[PDB]
Every structure is written in C-alpha cells, then in structure tokens.
Amino acid sequence: SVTEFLKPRLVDIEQVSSTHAKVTLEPLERGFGHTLGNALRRILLSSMPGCAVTEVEIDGVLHEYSTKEGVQEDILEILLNLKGLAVRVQGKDEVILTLNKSGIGPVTAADITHDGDVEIVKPQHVICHLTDENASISMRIKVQRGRGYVPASTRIGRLLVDACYSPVERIAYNVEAARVEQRTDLDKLVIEMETNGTIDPEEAIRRAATILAEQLEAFVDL
Amino acid sequence: VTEFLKPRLVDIEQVSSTHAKVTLEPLERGFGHTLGNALRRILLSSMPGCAVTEVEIDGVLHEYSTKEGVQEDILEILLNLKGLAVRVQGKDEVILTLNKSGIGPVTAADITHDGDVEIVKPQHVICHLTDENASISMRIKVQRGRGYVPASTRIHSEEDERPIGRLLVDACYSPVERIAYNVEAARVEQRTDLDKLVIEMETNGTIDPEEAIRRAATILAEQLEAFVDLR
Amino acid sequence: ARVTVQDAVEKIGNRFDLVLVAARRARQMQVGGKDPLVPEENDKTTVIALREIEEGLINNQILDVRERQEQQEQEAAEL
Amino acid sequence: EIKELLKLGDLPTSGQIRLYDGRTGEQFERPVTVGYMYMLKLNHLVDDKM
Amino acid sequence: QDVVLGLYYMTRDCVNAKGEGMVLTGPKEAERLYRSGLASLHARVKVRIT
Amino acid sequence: TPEEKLLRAIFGEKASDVKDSSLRVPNGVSGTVIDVQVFTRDGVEKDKRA
Amino acid sequence: REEAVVWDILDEVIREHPVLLNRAPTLHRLGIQAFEPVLIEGKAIQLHPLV
Amino acid sequence: KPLVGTGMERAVAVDSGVTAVAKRGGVVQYVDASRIVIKVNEDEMYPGEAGIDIYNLTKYTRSNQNTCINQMPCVSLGEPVERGDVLADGPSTDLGELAL
C-alpha cells in the first residue's frame, strides 16, 4: 500500500572500540538515509544531555594566560585536559570536585577526590604534570549538567572551560546505495559514532532516536 | 535539562485552496531545523495521492494521433490529464468518465460525477472541441499511489493490457508541490530559547495540510523504531 | 576482496612473476581439485591465489615441490 | 539594465541568493548564482551510444 | 577542480571568523564545532594535534 | 548431425522447411507502432493488410 | 527473458573480475586501466574522478 | 521559448518552412489539430474565388535524424489573423519563435 515503507532489516553494529561503533541500516527508502542520518547527527551533536566541566578555579591562577610554577603545561592545556574529562553525575545537576596533589608525576583523574554522586569514566586521564617535588596543584572543578556544546565565549578567579555536555565525540553518517530484488535506488545508512565513554555509542543512538520520536508524539497516528 | 518541551500543531493558516501555513510550537533550541528538514524531506517525497494512470479515448489507438474536431493532439490531452488533481475517498482506484460534445473547452468540470471522487480544480482544461458535431468520450483511470511512477515502469508489468487504445500516463502521485519552513522565536511564558516552526506548503489541493503533517511525522516515527530498538 | 596487490608483490619480488605464480595457483584451484589454503571469503580463485601468495603459503618453489610431490606420489602408487 | 530589471522583480541585483542544502537543511556558506538558463538536449543520447 | 577547491576553501583562514581563538582538544572537536555551527571552517584556532 | 538426427528420431519432431526471418524491434528500443505501409509489386497478390 | 536470477548470476560473475576501460586516443598506457565493475542502472559508465 | 533570446527567433522560425504561415489575412474559420481553415478577408480576395485558405498540418512524421516533425496550431477558433502570421508551430517553435 501507500502508507507502508521499507524499514531496515540488516542492522550491523561493528564495534571498533569500547566507545566507537559503526552501525549500518539497510535498506532504507530512497532519501531516508539523509533524513534519518542528519536528524540523528544533529540531535547527537546539539541536544544530547550530559555532564561536563564548565569551570575550574586553581589557587595561584587568576586568568587563563597566567602560569603556575612546578606544573609542566600552562593553564591553557590544563583547561584542555579538563575539557576532555568524562564524568557521570548520578543524583545532582551540579557538583564541585576537588583536586589536590603534590609531588612529581602525572595528576590523573584518579587523583580527583571521590564524591559519591560522581563517577570518573577514565581515571588515567592526565590533567597536568608536577615536576619539582615541592609544587602542589589544587583546584575546584565545577561539573554541571546541560546538553550539547556550550563554549566559554558565550558565557563571559575562576576559569571557564568549554562545556562538552553531550557524550558524543564524533558522529558521521554516510549514505550509500542499497538494492532489494528489483528495487535498486534504496539507501543504506552507515553511522560512525564515537562517545566520550560515559555511554556506549549504540545507547547514544537509541537515546537520540528516543528524543526525536518523543518530539514527534503530538502528530503521530498511533 | 533531561526533559524537552514537545511541539504541538498550533495553527493552520489556509492561505488558499492549495497553499497553507502550519505552525508547530514550542520547539527547543535546534529542533526547529531538525524537525523542519526531516518533515520537509518526507513531505516532499512520501506523500500519497491520486494520479491519472490510464486513459481510453474512444476512437484513438495511440497518443501520436489527432482526433477530428479536437484542437489538441492526443499526447497533449494526456499531458493535460496528467495534471488533473483528484481526491478519491474510500478507494485506491476509480474510473472517471468524460463525455462532452459541441464547441467549447472540455474542462475537469465535465467529468461525470462520481460520489467518492472530488475534482479540486474543475476549471482545469483538458481539451478544446472546435466543431459542433465533434464529441469526445474517455475513461480516465485515477489511481492512488506514492511518488513518481513513469509508464515505462508499468508497460510490461503484465496488467492484462490486451486493448490497443489504452494509453498509459506517467503518474506523479505526490500532492505536495513546495515545502518551505522557517524557524522563528516563540513567545512562551517564561523561556526565550523556544522556537516555532512554520511550514509553508503548496499542494495541488488534494491533501489536507494537517493530515500531511500527521502523515510525515508518522513516517518519521516509524523509521525511528529501528534506532530506538537498535538490535 | 583485493584492492591493492602490493603486499603479494613484496613476497614474489616481481609483478610479472606474481601474475604467473598466481595464475598457476588459480588454475589449480579452478579446474584442478585443489582446495584453497586460506579461508575462501567469497573470493574468486585469482584473489584467493593472491591472498595465499601474500601469506607466504604459495610461491613458485612451493608450487614446484607440491607438483613434484604429487607426481612422484601418483607415479609410485600403482602396481 | 539587468540589475534594474532584477530590482523591478524584487530580486537581489547581485544575481546571487542564499541557498540551503536539501539533504541537511543548512546554508551553503556563500551566496549562489541562481537563475534561468536555456538548456538544450543534444542528439547525443546515451541510448544511441551504449 | 572541485576537490582542490574544496580542500583550499577548507584550509583557508579568515581574520575574524566565528569561533576564533578557542582551544580545541583535537580534530574531532573542530568537526563537532563546525557541524554544530559554532565555529567557522576558517576560524584560526589552537588545536591539540598528535 | 547424427546426434540431432537421433534426437528427432526419438521425439518425432519434423524439421522446418522455412526459417524465421521476421522483422523484430531492435533490442533496447520500446515504442508504439504508429504507421504501417505495405508496398506490393505488380503481379503479387495483396494480403488482407495491404 | 532477463529473469530475476540472471541478475544474481551476473552479480556473482562480475565480482572479482576486472574490466579494462579505454578512452581514445590512447596516448600513453594510462589510457587503458582496469577497474572492478559495480553494476549500475544507467546506460553510462561511471568513471572515478581521480582517474 | 527562450526567456533570454536575441530577437532572431521569429526570423529563424518563419524563414524555415516548419511553421504554417498565413498566406492571406482573415479569420480562423475552423481550427483543429490537423488543419486550419481561414476565411480570407474581402480585402485580400481575388474575384471569382471561394476565399478560403486551408492549411494541412504535418502530424508526427520523422525527420532525417529520426526526430519527430509535428505541427500544432497556434490560433484559436474565430481568431483574426493577418498576412504572415504564424498559424501553426513546427518542431521547436513556440508561438512562431524558435524554441530549441
């Protein structure tokens, strides 16, 4: 009939890593590869909720272009290392982690003081390096819940970090040809997805699709 | 943060018989364009409609011929019938009949009245009879479908087309001619980041605008089930 | 499948000798009763021969000792 | 005179408009020359060549 | 033709392009910012490259 | 050939004294017959179509 | 008759089978190159841009 | 027709014989997909003459190139025509202008 559409039968999830997958849907009705891929890419990029480091306050630092003695990197690359810090907050919409460390070596995410409501995804994530056995790095890291990417230039003691709220690190889609038995112009949608580790890529695809399908509920003829 | 405001179909401004403006409101940040382009791409490709697929004009064998007393070739009559806009209620195929004699334009208002068939532009000229003893009589097969099905796809699919003189018309079934969408700011009580989506919609008059929005959103929601499940 | 044949050219140091070895092995698999030494992943015998050459399982010397073994074996196996 | 006639039809006298990608819905980053050209179908049809 | 024009347009720099002067964790962040419309392809920026 | 001679001995099928020399549509061409002209020589009898 | 199964047979006979594509004038040896065919629905050969 | 032409289109379409051009002016007495019948004005009639021009249009014949040659009438019934007016369009002409 005229209301029944080709829905995908071959769903091939290829897990390239713990946080990197290639989903493939085939066959799609012609043009639905771009419809579904772009709607999901756009939701995964801009509307997926999550938690992110929004700002940090370091003791001896007053502005981003300052320097701290004993730490290897400048404060710019410390903010960059905190930007990629994945985090899962269970019960709250805002927490303040505390990071105190002294000595020589890497200050990893495992050195962040353990809160009950907060879980660090990658504890071996390097934040900075202490170099001289007398310097201590101590900072207050504000983790906040939001959605999408919110840069710091739009939000201007404390040093603002670009808030990577959504767990997606990369989302790409590719629509190639698919053929079904005297139907030859169909779509095949390949979604290459990478998350930051807080959720796996297939759950993030399911969550984006749930967000879209819940947006559509006022018009769907159940 | 984890909960979104969901749009609802707020307003249908029917500018014309064939032009409408649907408003969806309220939309969160970024969802105006997500929903707008998904709905535009579905409305523009996936809507069902009725198209003339076959014509049997009474004396003619092929379309590369002329009828006596008619000013247009049979091929031009078939091109005029290709653009005939019909809405058929409760069927997926109907056969309309057009008999018309005497000098004058043979329009879509001259197709004989079926109960479950509505011609939305009755002033649509099909041919011109230029002779008082001239007469035309045709059996026009209107059929419901989706998309664009050329007759080349349909000749040698068997179709029991033993009659020479049954002429196939290429069927453009989509009732939607043009979709534009615009994402404006909404005037909601507390928030300022809420959008509204206006979908300007040119059709041939044979689909309701709200019905087409419902249908496109249903197609989206049924295509999203493979991702909501994702096994 | 097979996109670039460069890895088989390194084993059989010539592109011209590679074609001959691979066609000999591919004809063994195609019209002889020989089974591939690699998992046949829906490949044709030319590509299977190339995939065997690129794994070191087939070269001209291996094909020679295999045919000499079969020849002496079957000339000896009759009374 | 072309720009004066573009102005009369309420069009940009630059000849270039803002276009959107049909597949993603986002703007092409520069204005695009859109207009009407007279195209011709030549007798080198691929049915005769293949 | 088209490939070198696309690669040239992609690798050029504008002076005050949108998203100028931010510091990115890598090329994936640059692609996220370009695709979500928060940075221009020509924004001169500071990226951690390995 | 002796093999097809045996073949026709088993199944008794006569051989055709004529060969099919018909005019066919060229392959790939699909049209509509719009005109047929029959030119017959003097002394040849016109068929029902002529 | 072009039954539906001869297209499956055709999709498996062309699978790893290259074809040589040639444009005249063949001024040098890159005027003949071999390609793996992808069966398309047109009447025109689809050439890669980079070649 | 071309939206952007040069003005040589009418000359090209009329000076080739693909159109049906009015030999004498009159009124279209009978128009039909295969013929046009003009009742010539009394001003242009010779004495001892019916005063009727009949134009039989070429319908779906093949050119040397196996293309289609088809003439379609431009005029409507009862419409006044002048001498030299295009009465029927040939292949690739639109109201007497060359439309390629």
CA distances to A76, B219, E45 from A73, rounded to whole Å, are: 8, 52, 18
Q: Kindly state whether B65 is in contact with chain F, defined as any CB-CB distance less than 8 angstroms.
A: yes
CB contact under 8 A, G41 and A185: yes
The parent domain of residue B63 ranges over 48-172
* Contact predicate B169/B123, CB 8 Å: no
For B89, phi and psi rounded to 5 degrees?
Answer: -105, 115
Chain F residues with CB-CB distance to B152 below 8 A: 30
Q: Which of A25, A93, A208 sits opposite B1 (nearest CB)?
A: A93
3-state SS record for A39-59: HHHHHHHHCCEEEEEEEEEEC
d(CA A24, CA A21): 10
Cis peptide before A27 (omega within 30 of 0): yes
Q: Which of H30, H60, H68 sits opposite B130 (nearest CB)?
A: H30
**Interior/surface letters A75-113, b for 16+ CB within 10 angstroms, e for the rest:** bebbbbbbbbbbbbbeeeeebebebebeeeebbbbebbe
CA distance A161 to chain B (A): 19
Residue of A50, A55, A166, A194 whose CA lies nearest to A119? A50
Q: Could you count the other beta carbons within 10 Å of the beta carbon of residue B27?
A: 25
Surface-to-core class of residue A189, CB atoms within 10 Å of its CB (0-12 exposed, 13-18 middle, 19+ buried): buried
B93-101 and B135-146 beta bridge pairing:
antiparallel
Q: Could you count the other beta carbons within 10 Å of the beta carbon of residue A63?
A: 8
The partner residues of A177 in beta bridges, in order of sequence, read: A187
Q: Left if phi > 0, otherwise alpha if psi is -120 to 50, otherwise beta: which for B197?
A: beta
Q: Which of A35, A213, A221 sits opposite B42 (nearest CB)?
A: A35
Q: Give the CATH number, domain containing residue A71.
A: 2.170.120.12
CA distance H91 to chain B (A): 14
Resolution given for this structure, in angstroms: 2.5
Rg value, chain D, Cα: 17
Q: Kindly state whether D45 is in contact with chain G, defined as any CB-CB distance less than 8 angstroms.
A: no
CB contact under 8 A, C1 and G17: no
Angle (CA) H38 H42 H45, round 5°: 75
For B194, phi and psi rounded to 5 degrees?
Answer: -85, 135
Per-residue tokens: H17: 């014989």
Residues 6+ apart with CB under 8 A from E9: E41
The parent domain of residue C52 ranges over 1-79
CA distance B82 to chain H (A): 19
Q: Kindly state whether B129 is in contact with chain H, defined as any CB-CB distance less than 8 angstroms.
A: no
CA distances to A210, C71, D50, H16 from D45, rounded to whole Å, are: 49, 59, 9, 25
Cis peptide before H91 (omega within 30 of 0): no
With contact defined as 3+ CB pairs under 8 Å, the chains touching F are B
Which residue type does D14 have?
A: S
Surface-to-core class of residue C16, CB atoms within 10 Å of its CB (0-12 exposed, 13-18 middle, 19+ buried): exposed
Residues 6+ apart with CB under 8 A from G39: G10, G11, G14
Q: Which technique?
A: cryo-EM
Residues 6+ apart with CB under 8 A from B149: B53, B170, B171, B173
With contact defined as 3+ CB pairs under 8 Å, the chains touching C are G
d(CA B136, CA A43): 57
Chain B residues with CB-CB distance to A28 below 8 A: 223
Q: Which of B173, B224, B229 sits opposite A212 (nearest CB)?
A: B224
Chain G residues with CB-CB distance to A188 below 8 A: none
* Contact predicate A147/A50, CB 8 Å: yes
Interchain contact C/F (3 or more Cβ pairs less than 8 Å): no
Q: Structural domain tally of chain C? A: 1
Q: Could you count the other beta carbons within 10 Å of the beta carbon of residue A19?
A: 22
**Residue B57 DSSP symbol:** E
Cis peptide before G25 (omega within 30 of 0): yes
**Interior/surface letters B113-140, b for 16+ CB within 10 angstroms, e for the rest:** ebeebbbbbeebebbbbbbeebbbebeb
Chain H residues with CB-CB distance to D38 below 8 A: 2-4, 100
d(CA A113, CA B51): 70
CB contact under 8 A, B30 and A213: no
